[PDB]
Enzyme design. Structure first.
Site, short mmCIF file in Angstrom:
data_model
loop_
_atom_site.label_atom_id
_atom_site.label_comp_id
_atom_site.label_asym_id
_atom_site.label_seq_id
_atom_site.Cartn_x
_atom_site.Cartn_y
_atom_site.Cartn_z
CD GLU A 1 1.29 -8.77 5.10
OE1 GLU A 1 1.46 -9.51 4.48
OE2 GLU A 1 1.90 -7.75 5.46
NE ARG B 1 2.43 -9.15 0.34
CZ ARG B 1 2.65 -8.04 1.07
NH1 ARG B 1 2.52 -8.07 2.19
NH2 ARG B 1 3.11 -6.94 0.22
CB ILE C 1 -1.03 -0.04 1.00
CG1 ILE C 1 -1.93 -1.05 0.99
CG2 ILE C 1 -1.65 1.41 1.33
CD1 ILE C 1 -3.01 -1.25 2.46
#
Length: 246
Positions: free
Chosen positions: A160, A163, A71
């Site tokens: 996250e 991911r 970000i």
């Protein structure tokens, strides 16, 4: 733009959102059915904008670097907010140009700085959709002494989660509840680059890492990951940082 709305949100709709966030990231290869992100892109293609709306209909637009899913900054109303770091300064030449008021956040976007600015570690900050509701609110009204904490919620709920499927699953599981994320979740977050690198290496090295990655398990024990089957980690990680982008 990939969009999430909290109103009527379910485990599935949070799943669709994260799934779409991953699909928005360019990749030419998959390794072990995991998208390999691009190593670099021109400025005109480097950024995506994600919209998140809380239950009170208040929207933030979040800018990510699509090569690394970091970000860069966010927009609320007619104000943009960028991390105090060189990548985010570069992003500011491309995104939120139509926002007339411009704030540089007093920290970079890394967890060390954010945890220090917030006065607390991730382990003690709730995640889950109620937590994401309040982080959007905090950011929408830029309550500055509470923004670092809200950004850590936001990063974990977008970057996250994209991911790692386990992170996605845990955040979306109980929509009316929060949880405190484990040392296991934190070690996944801290080790993304290393795992990414080792999985690319593994593909050329008979399934084996060249350098082991130490993670924390669900029982809080240090575990040594040295191949693509160890701890089923290749079915958790859901994007790879390109080894030429580290």
């Amino acid at each position: 733009d990939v969009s999430f709305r909290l109103s009527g949100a379910t485990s599935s709709s949070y799943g669709v959102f994260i799934s779409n966030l991953r699909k928005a990231l360019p990749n030419e290869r998959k390794l072990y059915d995991i998208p390999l992100l691009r190593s670099s892109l021109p400025g005109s293609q480097r950024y995506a904008l994600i919209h998140l709306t809380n239950y009170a209909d208040e929207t933030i637009s979040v800018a990510i670097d699509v090569t690394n899913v970091y970000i860069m900054g966010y927009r609320a109303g007619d104000t943009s907010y960028f991390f105090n770091e060189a990548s985010a300064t570069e992003a500011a030449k491309y995104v939120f140009k139509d926002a007339m008021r411009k704030v540089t956040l007093p920290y970079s976007g890394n967890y060390e700085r954010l945890q220090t600015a917030a006065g607390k570690i991730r382990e003690n900050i709730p995640l889950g959709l109620p937590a994401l509701d309040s982080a959007i609110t905090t950011l929408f009204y830029y309550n500055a002494n509470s923004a670092a904490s809200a950004l850590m919620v936001l990063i974990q709920s977008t970057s996250e989660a994209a991911r790692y499927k386990f992170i996605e699953q845990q955040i979306g599981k109980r929509v009316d509840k929060t949880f405190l994320p484990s040392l296991a979740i934190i070690s996944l977050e801290n080790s993304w680059s290393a795992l990414s690198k080792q999985i690319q290496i593994a593909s050329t090295n008979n399934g084996q890492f060249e350098s082991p990655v130490v993670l924390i398990n669900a029982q809080n024990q240090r575990v040594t990951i040295t191949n693509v089957d160890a701890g089923k980690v290749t079915s958790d990680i859901a994007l790879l940082l390109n080894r030429n982008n580290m």
